[PDB]
Design a protein around this ligand. Structure first.
Ligand SMILES: CCCCCCCCCCCCCCCCCC(=O)OC[C@H](CO[C@@H]1O[C@H](CO[C@H]2O[C@H](CO)[C@H](O)[C@H](O)[C@H]2O)[C@H](O)[C@H](O)[C@H]1O)OC(=O)CCCCCCCCCCCCCCCCC
Ligand SMILES: CCCCCCCCCCCCCCCCCC(=O)OC[C@H](CO[C@@H]1O[C@H](CO[C@H]2O[C@H](CO)[C@H](O)[C@H](O)[C@H]2O)[C@H](O)[C@H](O)[C@H]1O)OC(=O)CCCCCCCCCCCCCCCCC
Ligand code: CLA
Ligand code: CLA
Ligand code: CLA
Ligand code: CLA
Ligand code: CLA
Ligand SMILES: CCCCCCCCCCCCCCCC(=O)OC[C@H](CO[C@@H]1O[C@H](CS(=O)(=O)O)[C@@H](O)[C@H](O)[C@H]1O)OC(=O)CCCCCCCCCCCCCCC
Ligand SMILES: CC1=C(/C=C/C(C)=C/C=C/C(C)=C/C=C/C=C(C)/C=C/C=C(C)/C=C/C2=C(C)CCCC2(C)C)C(C)(C)CCC1
Ligand SMILES: CC1=C(/C=C/C(C)=C/C=C/C(C)=C/C=C/C=C(C)/C=C/C=C(C)/C=C/C2=C(C)CCCC2(C)C)C(C)(C)CCC1
Ligand SMILES: CCCCCCCCCCCCCCCCCC(=O)O
Ligand code: OEY
Ligand SMILES: [Cl-]
Ligand SMILES: [Cl-]
Ligand SMILES: [Fe+2]
Lengths: 82, 334, 341, 34, 137, 451
């Protein structure tokens, strides 16, 4: 039977549906695009940019080797990039 | 009627306990020859120079194997794809040394298995059934052709066919990964979806029919006696099963057509295993899994390893150690 | 009515997506496990834990993205966001591997919630809870592989990472270090999964090709009414087909569908048991009698010894980069290699 | 006379709107140069 | 790390003069190196003679020295054995043998220099990986 | 609603082309429009290949599968397989693409506007699947068309500029064929060769004379068979043996196509005569043999005595004997000793590879071809990274022999499945139980119990 909600086939074909979503969908797409193009996703998650994996002359990986000094360890690695 | 017609009626008789049929006329002698040779070779056959380098691998129980390590060993690389019947050898001893039983077994077997498929069609016709059970069997049969026939063809040697053994299968799988990166090949990823999904949907459908069995027994007896062989009624409430499973997910993720539901059970693992058979068959021609080795580099050009580069380090370990004495030149082109 | 009874009413309302009491556990944890995996494969690195890029943002594709395991120096830490390692710092949390425990632990409880949902919905509709029972095998697998196995090892580092190629690395690790193909519990696992897929295909095919003609069309799907009483295919003709083709056949439909439950479920349970052993490195790695003979007899060779040579290749060639915290330095000359290659 | 805001509404939007956001993010990534 | 001009600075000649390439010439030399040389030289080794790689130390001990742009350009015109004693244009691609090695025909003097720079710049980035073979993959 | 719906035609939308089984005009339209797509693709692809073609690179480095088919026929190519004039490629492409428009026009005309069934408009073009006379007649016509097409290849080789002959003295060239092989002991000998190693059934054909000769026989056989079927109707043993229905005829062809797909697969992988390695890249065996040759040469140059170099296993490091004694390259390539190629045969004497010729007669062009082929072995990844699975990114290469073999195995396999599907259905349909078992007369229920 029917649990009482409006049928999806009815909603997506409705004009009012697309009036609302001709904006929200492209707006959300643009918001995500901006999230990366501003470089903001690097800083929120601590992901290296292509230039910040190694120091200029090092080939060693900044692997964290301590449980409780780990947050301190990562920050020390980040300042040897400058 | 005359003798030929009496024979034909017997051959095609639907009253034989096991159906014979025209396919069975080929299937029985070939499956018997293959089976008898397999059993004797697995127990007693002496060591086989699989890689053609005069370094025989012992495959049989009497020569120090157990059930897990034993195998009928593929025929010698010196033979490549040449036909090596018993009568081409100078002696059975020579035939044993070079891995003759492997050719005899797999050819008789592939022939008989093909006829098994055809026999499935044949009895379905005498019985008045729809004919496509044999299509379902074509997925495992194609898989068998892939590893025993197609892959030795494209690599040019039966010595690179799959061994008839438990440990030899794993040897085949590991060498295959190193040379084709089969894990990174989507037809194998399709085959995993095919069998994982098959097992899932097996458990689902079994659990869902079992869940909606109609009470026809008391608690001191097996519910299986609630079903009588040949009964016209169904023994479970498919509406109840839909009602349960539709609420478990949502109403339209659930089947209510038994025929649709059952065809889906047939189609999912068959298609997936078709693809994995096609995966072995096309990697026989060295169209391998995706290669993302050093795909990620940084601003300077340093390689930034991904999980694919780790997989490559395991592949390289399998590459350099497999058939350790067999290669004289830096590339392993087949 | 009490407030409890009224909340019970609304949780159990018949709606497009049933909620229930179990939903309070299921939907938050399943969504957050899902979301954390998406978030991490899109944006999060494994640079400081593994020396690996692991996200779309770093230029990985769908097969090579992963939420990777924490660094080995974390041991078995819960890696709480507010715990001593990250100290509430979300960015450092991602960098230290916290999304892995985030996904693993929320997913554990999500799986608990889903099973309770199966119990809850079965209880309300009125059917026996065999579906919930069958779902014990996925849970046994998840718990043994993602939780028990690393808890027996040195750290979460060696649990599986959540990614397509990461799981492939896991497979190959188990071959080279554990000789897992040789394990009888995995072999039973393989028999149950391959056997399940077989039963799925053969039963589906058998039903489709013993249908009764209940309509006039060539598409036979419309000739089935879900309220009909009669069986839609011939159990008698199927039984005779298979008796004459294969020698035996099912004759009891109830045993047939219980067997379909039993086979894949029992298979996964058996593999779970084997991985618990591997938590302790309690492997079926060797056959002693073969090793005693091989060591004394340089002409004795089987597929067993050949595969151990392959295992030694995997370990030595993959360890330095796969366990970077160990600082393995293997000069070229110690690497095991056959001729030429 | 159907409602517009249902539990179902929350369900599709808990999934759909993050999905679209993530797609635009992944789209932009294809133009990152090293 | 990034591709800086210090990285992009390589010996012009044996006499010690250097030259600084642009990012464009580096990428150009890599594309062309793939086009005309990688089939045998992928990653700095030599598939058809693994005893000779493209490591700078190796190029240095060649006769004449090959660890500089002019030395490499000269090799791609008139290649010789490691000791300079024989000319190998008949079995090694070069401008001298662009009739038998057709991929060399369209190449120009700027192209050979870009390829030479790529070869000389690449072990500065990759280290042991360049010319080390599968051990360092 | 002329069929076009499930209720009237009996077939659901996903099996909709089965609504066409007894609409010969609408069916004719489908076949001609589909032929339009085949000719279209042949046209567009060649022009695509021509747009992307760089004549200084080998064809097999450029992802070409159609231009190699034109070059093999003698057009646009000179000694050594060097490309001299790209204009015939352009002609072949343009002419196919133009034709697809007229094919496509006639297909869309017949499928949409034309008469749905041909039988009332014309007794010659209309047909009934069960008319065993009309069916062998149409078969006969298409046989003649096929024999003619086979003779077109003969016309090209003997009268219209010849064919590319990889075996031609001096490194390969276009060559008029003047003495095709007519001796039927040779032509039909090929059909009786074993398909196993060192024999190769028809895949072993290694000279253009046998190729042109066999196409004379086939062209004449097809023309004569077409006449035979135009004039005759099937005999009684044939009438009792076959199912005479549209679907049955479909299934016979599906099986036939499947068989041919598997043979083509093996042809493109092993044969280097009608798939010249100059255009298609080396075969798998060829590249592996070329590796052993490369390192024989390098080491012999350094002073090694290659004939007496005992390898690690006790077998010769460079040279050893096949099981029938021929001298062959050693190492794993021992499996490939059946390989034959223009660059290697000069080193062959009566006992196999000749050690004197190896020590003295190896020319720089052989060292070049052997190095080129070893480095273009048909190994490579799905994203076209060339080499073994463990190679790093750099070389963007997959051999067209790999592309052509793998694609046609897949197609050949799925057409075998299609054969089984339609053959079993055609049988069940002809007997009247393709829609299921009749409840009121279930055949099994009228049989004795097995036990
Ligand atoms: C089926 C139902 C499924 C439902 C599951 C739903 C999910 C439930 C949530 C589960 C989360 C459990 C996390 C347990 C973490 C853990 O264990 O964390 C591990 C810690 C122990 O910490 C470890 O301790 C180790 C031993 O160190 C000790 O010894 C060292 C010796 O050198 C030093 O002396 C050191 O100071 C001292 O601490 C190392 O230090 C490790 O690095 C460190 O991680 O134990 C502790 O938290 C607690 C230990 C008490 C045991 C609690 C039981 C949990 C384990 C059950 C499985 C055990 C069997 C595994 C197979 C074997
Ligand atoms: C109804 C029909 C029923 C059939 C009943 C009889 C079945 C027998 C068929 C035997 C096929 C199996 C073994 C053949 C495998 C083989 O080595 O096949 C390869 C041979 C080619 O042989 C090679 O041919 C070569 C020819 O090249 C030679 O000549 C060339 C000339 O240019 C080059 O110079 C080259 O260097 C030189 O070596 C050499 O002779 C090689 O040594 C030799 O191996 O192909 C061929 O004969 C073409 C045929 C291959 C067909 C592939 C079989 C179909 C695949 C199984 C179907 C899957 C089933 C689906 C499951 C459901
Ligand atoms: C597209 C090609 C084609 C097709 C589909 C047919 C189809 C048919 N032909 Mg025609 N035919 C053709 C081409 C074709 N023919 C050509 C080119 C010739 C000239 C040689 C003939 C000459 C010919 C004659 C003389 C006769 C037919 C007959 C028939 C009918 C019986 C078919 C039969 O029994 O199959 C074959 C199935 C069998 C069981 C027969 C045994 C064949 C064995 C099993 C195969 C092995 C032998 C093989 C021929 C050679 C070995 C090759 C091997 C190495 C691979 C059928 C309608 C018969 C008929 O009714 O005529 C009106 C008949 O008498 N055909
Ligand atoms: C279904 C609900 C649910 C469940 C089971 C979990 C479970 C978990 N989450 Mg998740 N979480 C949820 C929803 C949920 N979460 C939601 C909705 C969000 C988004 C805001 C998050 C965001 C989130 C983050 C960001 C993190 C977790 C983390 C955790 C873990 C640690 C939890 C902890 O220490 O709690 C401690 C708190 C309690 C156990 C609650 C105690 C309640 C009271 C005080 C007890 C005393 C009662 C009193 C004495 C008697 C009352 C009687 C009554 C009659 C009144 C655990 C796996 C962490 C994790 O995964 O680490 C890796 C982590 O970092 N969660
Ligand atoms: C090779 C592909 C191919 C071809 C040639 C056909 C051909 C045909 N189909 Mg099949 N079909 C196909 C694929 C194909 N189909 C697939 C993939 C499906 C599954 C979705 C179906 C499902 C299907 C069903 C369910 C039915 C058919 C039917 C038909 C027939 C009539 C169609 C009709 O009335 O359309 C009318 C449509 C239109 C008038 C719209 C425009 C159609 C034209 C042809 C488009 C041409 C575009 C092109 C650019 C023109 C270039 C012009 C240029 C040359 C000048 C026709 C002979 C019908 C049938 O059997 O009739 C009884 C029918 O019921 N087909
Ligand atoms: C016999 C069929 C066949 C074969 C062997 C090839 C082979 C080739 N083509 Mg071609 N092609 C074909 C049909 C074929 N094509 C068709 C029908 C089209 C029209 C769409 C094209 C359009 C085409 C273009 C536009 C281009 C090629 C290119 C290429 C090359 C690289 C292909 C690649 O990267 O695959 C990538 C692999 C895949 C996409 C995997 C496909 C997986 C499929 C969808 C699953 C199969 C399912 C089904 C049951 C079969 C290679 C030489 C390229 C080239 O180098 O040109 C010079 C190129 O740019 N082809
Ligand atoms: C094999 C394909 C094929 C077949 C069997 C038919 C059959 C038919 N068509 Mg169709 N048609 C086709 C292709 C085909 N057509 C194509 C490609 C087009 C577009 C150009 C048309 C356009 C078309 C129209 C517009 C009409 C028909 C009509 C007809 C009917 C009578 C035609 C007639 O007798 O002409 C007489 C035959 C001749 C004069 C013989 C000469 C034909 C050419 C010049 C011979 C070329 C052969 C060539 C050498 C072979 C190689 C070709 C290629 C492989 C290179 C008949 C049912 C008519 C009909 O029934 O509608 C009411 C109609 O009005 N057809
Ligand atoms: C800081 C937290 C803020 C809240 C965040 C949400 C997370 C908390 C868990 C609750 C998730 C689901 C809430 C459902 C909201 C809803 O649609 O009903 C709330 C009401 C009633 O809708 C009603 O929806 C009903 C359909 S059903 O119950 O959802 O099936 C229907 O019965 C009724 O007639 C109709 O009017 O509608 C609105 O939302 C007004 C806008
Ligand atoms: C029926 C049908 C169908 C089908 C259809 C079809 C199949 C069709 C086809 C069609 C076709 C098949 C068409 C064709 C077309 C073509 C054309 C249109 C061409 C053109 C050409 C040109 C124009 C060219 C040009 C040029 C030149 C000349 C030179 C160079 C450059 C160029 C290229 C530009 C469908 C399924 C859909 C649907 C249903 C029905
Ligand atoms: C061109 C060429 C050539 C030639 C070729 C030829 C000459 C061919 C021929 C061909 C042929 C000559 C073929 C044949 C075929 C056959 C077949 C394929 C058969 C089939 C059959 C069938 C199928 C049958 C079946 C059946 C039975 C058995 C029983 C009953 C039922 C039935 C009928 C079904 C050569 C190589 C030199 C070279 C290159 C080129
Ligand atoms: C000394 C360190 C201080 C760190 C303070 C900042 C940390 C705040 C984290 C808040 C996370 C809230 C989600 C946790 C609730 C989920 C557990 C549950 O609901 O059962
Ligand atoms: O892996 Mn590696 O590649 Ca196919 O051959 Mn060359 O070596 Mn050997 O014989 Mn068995 O196997
Ligand atoms: Cl091995
Ligand atoms: Cl070798
Ligand atoms: Fe069932």
């Amino acid at each position: 039977g029917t649990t009482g909600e409006r049928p999806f086939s009815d909603i997506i074909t409705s004009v009012r549906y697309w009036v609302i979503h001709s904006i929200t969908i492209p707006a959300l797409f643009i918001a995500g695009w901006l999230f990366v193009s501003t470089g903001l996703a690097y800083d929120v998650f601590g992901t290296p940019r292509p230039d910040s994996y190694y120091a200029q002359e090092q080939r060693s990986i900044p692997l964290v080797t301590d449980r409780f000094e780990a947050k301190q360890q990562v920050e020390t690695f980040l300042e040897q990039l400058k | 009627a005359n003798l030929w017609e009496r024979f034909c009626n017997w051959v095609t008789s639907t009253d034989n306990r096991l159906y014979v049929g025209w396919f069975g006329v080929i299937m029985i002698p070939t499956l018997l020859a293959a089976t008898i040779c397999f059993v004797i070779a697995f127990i007693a056959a002496p060591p086989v120079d699989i890689d053609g380098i005069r370094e025989p691998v012992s495959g049989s129980l009497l020569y120090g194997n157990n059930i897990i390590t034993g195998a009928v060993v593929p025929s010698s690389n010196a033979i490549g794809l040449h036909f090596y019947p018993i009568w081409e050898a100078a002696s059975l001893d020579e035939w044993l040394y070079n891995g003759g039983p492997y050719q005899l077994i797999i050819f008789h077997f592939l022939l008989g298995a093909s006829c098994y498929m055809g026999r499935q069609w044949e009895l379905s016709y005498r019985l008045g059934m729809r004919p496509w059970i044999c299509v379902a069997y074509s997925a495992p049969l194609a898989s068998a052709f892939a590893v025993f026939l197609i892959y030795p063809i494209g690599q040019g040697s039966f010595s690179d066919g799959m061994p008839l053994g438990i440990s030899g299968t794993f040897n085949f799988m590991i060498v295959f990964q190193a040379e084709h990166n089969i894990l990174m090949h989507p037809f194998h990823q399709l085959g995993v979806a095919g069998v994982f999904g098959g097992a899932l949907f097996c458990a689902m459908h079994g659990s869902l029919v079992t869940s909606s069995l109609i009470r026809e027994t008391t608690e001191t007896e097996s519910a299986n006696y609630g079903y009588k062989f040949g009964q016209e009624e169904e023994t479970y409430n498919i509406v109840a099963a839909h009602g349960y499973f539709g609420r478990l997910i949502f109403q339209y993720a659930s089947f209510n057509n038994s025929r649709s539901l059952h065809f889906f059970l047939a189609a999912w693992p068959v298609v997936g295993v078709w693809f994995t058979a096609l995966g072995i068959s096309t990697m026989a021609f060295n169209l391998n899994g995706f290669n993302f080795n050093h795909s990620v580099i940084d601003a300077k050009g340093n390689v930034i390893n991904t999980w694919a580069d780790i997989i490559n380090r395991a592949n390289l370990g399998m590459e350099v150690m497999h058939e350790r004495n067999a290669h004289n030149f830096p590339l392993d082109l087949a | 009515r009490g407030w409890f009874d009224i909340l019970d009413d609304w949780l159990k309302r018949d709606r497009f997506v049933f909620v229930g009491w179990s939903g309070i556990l299921l939907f938050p944890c399943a969504y957050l496990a899902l979301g954390g995996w998406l978030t991490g494969t899109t944006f999060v690195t494994s640079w400081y834990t593994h020396g690996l890029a692991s996200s779309y943002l770093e230029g990985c594709n769908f097969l090579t993205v992963a939420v990777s395991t924490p660094a080995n120096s974390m041991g078995h830490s819960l890696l709480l966001l507010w715990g001593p390692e990250a100290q509430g710092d979300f960015t450092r949390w991602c960098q230290l591997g916290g999304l892995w425990t985030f996904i693993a632990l929320h997913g554990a409880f999500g799986l608990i919630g889903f099973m309770l949902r199966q119990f809850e919905i079965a209880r309300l509709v009125g059917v026996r809870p065999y579906n919930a029972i069958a779902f014990s095998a996925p849970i046994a697998v998840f718990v043994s592989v993602f939780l028990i196995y690393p808890l027996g090892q040195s750290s979460w580092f060696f649990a599986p990472s959540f990614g397509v190629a990461a799981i492939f690395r896991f497979l190959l690790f188990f071959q080279g270090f554990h000789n897992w193909t040789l394990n009888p519990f995995h072999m039973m696992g393989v028999a149950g999964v391959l056997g399940g897929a077989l039963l799925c295909a053969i039963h589906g095919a058998t039903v489709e090709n013993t249908l009764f003609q209940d309509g006039e069309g060539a598409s036979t799907f419309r000739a089935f009414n879900p309220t009909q009483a009669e069986e839609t295919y011939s159990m008698v003709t199927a039984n005779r087909f298979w008796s004459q083709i294969f020698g035996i056949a099912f004759s009891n439909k109830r045993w047939l569908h219980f067997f379909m439950l039993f086979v894949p479920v029992t298979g996964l349970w058996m593999s779970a048991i084997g991985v618990v052993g591997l938590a302790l490195n309690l492997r079926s790695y060797d056959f002693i009698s073969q090793e005693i003979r091989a060591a004394e007899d340089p002409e004795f060779e089987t597929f067993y010894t050949k595969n151990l040579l392959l295992n030694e290749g995997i370990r030595a060639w993959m360890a330095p980069q796969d366990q970077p915290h160990e600082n393995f330095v293997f000069p070229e000359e110690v690497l095991p290699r056959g001729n030429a290659l | 006379s159907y409602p517009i805001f249902t539990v179902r509404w929350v369900a599709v939007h808990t999934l759909a709107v993050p999905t679209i956001f993530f797609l635009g993010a992944i789209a932009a990534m294809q133009f990152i140069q090293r | 790390a990034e591709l800086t001009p210090e990285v992009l600075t390589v010996p012009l000649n044996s006499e010690g003069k250097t030259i600084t390439l642009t990012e464009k010439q580096y990428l150009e030399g890599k594309r062309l190196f793939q086009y005309a040389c990688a089939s045998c030289h992928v990653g700095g080794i030599t598939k058809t003679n693994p005893s000779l790689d493209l490591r700078t130390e190796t190029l240095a001990l060649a006769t004449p020295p090959r660890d500089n742009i002019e030395g490499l350009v000269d090799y791609m015109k008139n290649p010789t054995t490691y000791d300079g004693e024989q000319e190998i244009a008949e079995v090694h691609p070069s401008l001298r043998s662009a009739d038998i090695f057709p991929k060399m025909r369209n190449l120009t003097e700027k192209d050979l220099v870009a390829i030479a720079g790529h070869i000389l710049v690449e072990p500065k980035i990759l280290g042991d990986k360049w010319g080390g073979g599968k051990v360092y993959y | 609603a002329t069929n076009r719906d499930q209720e009237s035609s009996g077939f659901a939308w996903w099996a909709g082309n089965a609504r066409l089984i007894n609409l010969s005009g609408k069916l004719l339209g489908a076949h001609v429009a589909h032929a339009g797509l085949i000719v279209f693709w042949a046209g567009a692809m060649t022009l695509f290949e021509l747009a992307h073609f760089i004549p200084e690179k080998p064809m097999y480095e450029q992802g070409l599968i159609l231009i190699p088919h034109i070059a093999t026929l003698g057009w646009g190519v000179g000694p050594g397989g060097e490309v001299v004039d790209t204009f015939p490629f352009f002609v072949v492409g343009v002419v196919h693409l133009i034709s697809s428009a007229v094919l496509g026009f006639g297909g869309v005309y017949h499928a949409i506007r034309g008469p749905e069934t041909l039988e009332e408009y014309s007794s010659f073009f209309g047909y009934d699947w069960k008319d065993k006379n009309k069916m062998t007649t149409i078969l006969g016509f298409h046989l003649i068309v096929l024999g003619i097409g086979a003779l077109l290849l003969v016309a090209k080789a003997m009268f219209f500029g010849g064919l590319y002959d990889t075996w031609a003295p001096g490194g390969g060239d276009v060559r008029v064929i003047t003495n095709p092989t007519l001796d039927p002991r040779v032509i039909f000998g090929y059909l009786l060769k074993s398909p196993f190693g060192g024999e190769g059934w028809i895949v072993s054909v290694n000279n253009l004379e046998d190729v042109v000769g066999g196409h004379i026989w086939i062209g004449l056989i097809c023309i004569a068979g077409g006449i035979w079927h135009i004039l005759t109707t099937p005999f009684g043993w044939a009438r009792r043996a076959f199912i005479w229905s549209g679907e049955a005829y479909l299934s016979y062809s599906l099986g036939a196509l499947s068989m041919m797909g598997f043979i083509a697969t093996c042809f493109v992988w092993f044969n280097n005569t009608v798939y010249p390695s100059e255009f298609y890249g080396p075969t798998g065996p060829e590249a592996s043999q070329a590796q052993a040759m490369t390192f024989l040469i390098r080491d012999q140059k350094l002073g090694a005595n290659v004939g007496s170099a005992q390898g690690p296993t006790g077998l010769g490091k460079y040279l050893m004997r096949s099981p029938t004694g021929e001298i062959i390259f050693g190492g794993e390539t021992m499996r490939f000793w059946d390989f034959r190629g223009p660059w290697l045969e000069p080193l062959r004497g009566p006992n196999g590879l000749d050690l004197n010729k190896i020590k003295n007669d190896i020319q720089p062009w052989q060292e070049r071809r052997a190095a080129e082929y070893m480095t273009h072995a048909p190994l490579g990844s799905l994203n076209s990274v060339g080499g073994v699975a463990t190679e790093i990114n750099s070389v963007n290469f997959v051999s067209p022999r790999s592309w052509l073999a793998t694609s046609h195995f897949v197609l050949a396999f799925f057409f075998l499945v299609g054969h089984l599907w339609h053959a079993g259905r055609a049988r069940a349909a002809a007997a009247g139980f393709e829609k299921g078992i009749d409840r009121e007369s279930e055949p099994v229920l009228s049989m004795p119990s097995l036990d």
